[PDB]
């Protein structure tokens, strides 16, 4: 669906260690690297709030 902007980031993996693979949200930040863990990201645009739920009662 072409109704957004970032909604998979293809990236690759550690620079360090090309098959450990960065994992999403530093401990509240970008992706880190389990064994460097190296912090990578900051844009990801803001959509968590457009409606966002699980079916309506009305
Ligand atoms: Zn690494």
């Given at each position: 669906?072409?109704?957004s ?54």
């Amino acid at each position: 669906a072409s109704t957004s902007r970032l909604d998979a980031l293809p990236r690759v993996t550690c620079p360090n260690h090309p098959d450990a693979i960065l994992v999403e949200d530093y401990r509240a930040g970008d992706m880190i690297c389990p064994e460097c863990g190296l912090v990578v990201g900051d844009r990801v645009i803001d959509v968590g709030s457009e409606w966002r739920t699980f079916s309506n009662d009305k």
